[PDB]
Amino acid sequence: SAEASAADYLERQGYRILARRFKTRCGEIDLVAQRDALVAFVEVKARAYAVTPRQQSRIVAAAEAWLSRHPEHAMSELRFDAILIAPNTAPRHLPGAFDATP
Amino acid sequence: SAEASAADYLERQGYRILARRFKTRCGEIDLVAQRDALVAFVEVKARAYAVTPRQQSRIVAAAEAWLSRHPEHAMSELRFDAILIAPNTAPRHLPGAFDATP
Numbered sequence: 384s385a386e387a388s389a390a391d392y393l394e395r396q397g398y399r400i401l402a403r404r405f406k407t408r409c410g411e412i413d414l415v416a417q418r419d420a421l422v423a424f425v426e427v428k429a430r431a432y433a434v435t436p437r438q439q440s441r442i443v444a445a446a447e448a449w450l451s452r453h454p455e456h457a458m459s460e461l462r463f464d465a466i467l468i469a470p471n472t473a474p475r476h477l478p479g480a481f482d483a484t485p
Numbered sequence: 486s487a488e489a490s491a492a493d494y495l496e497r498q499g500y501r502i503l504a505r506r507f508k509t510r511c512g513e514i515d516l517v518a519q520r521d522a523l524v525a526f527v528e529v530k531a532r533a534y535a536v537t538p539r540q541q542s543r544i545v546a547a548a549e550a551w552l553s554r555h556p557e558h559a560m561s562e563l564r565f566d567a568i569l570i571a572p573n574t575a576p577r578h579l580p581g582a583f584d585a586t587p
Contacts, residue, residue, distance in 0.1 A: 409511040436585040443542040483538040
């Protein structure tokens with residue numbers, strides 16, 4: 384329901400959800416969302432903030448698998464996000480929570 | 486022979502080679518080397534310098550697989566390195582080429 388909360392939030396903020404709980408052999412992505420020419424790969428976390436090298440490794444590995452199977456996004460802007468879900472407050476969206484830029 | 490060059494260099498610099506061309510389902514490590522309580526996971530590259538998010542993802546994934554299967558290093562100091570191999574010069578060792586610290 385943290386994941387449903389996060390997705391509902393992103394939809395209210397103008398995103399389309401492309402995948403939920405996306406699994407591949409080498410990683411996973413809680414949400415894949417799109418707005419305009421931008422694809423966001425989103426980690427949902429129970430609530431500064433810093434993504435673990437392990438999670439980064441796994442989300443990058445999963446993004447790679449996703450992009451390969453969705454040629455329509457081969458040249459889209461990619462962004463790695465977090466959403467923090469805490470008990471008595473709105474989801475907090477951290478766009479670009481880490482940089483996977485070359 | 487870039488890999489042999491790198492390993493020979495590290496041995497001259499006091500390291501023991503634990504693995505060469507280490508493969509796992511989700512990544513690979515060109516050299517695993519040890520000195521004292523320190524394990525170095527080393528990417529060998531033909532010659533500042535910056536490891537790609539993809540390679541980082543893969544070397545971290547492979548380090549994780551390695552560490553799990555070598556309990557003796559569960560609590561060792563870990564470092565991620567690069568060695569640059571260029572044509573008319575000694576290997577260049579970049580210890581801690583990236584940070585995988587939590």
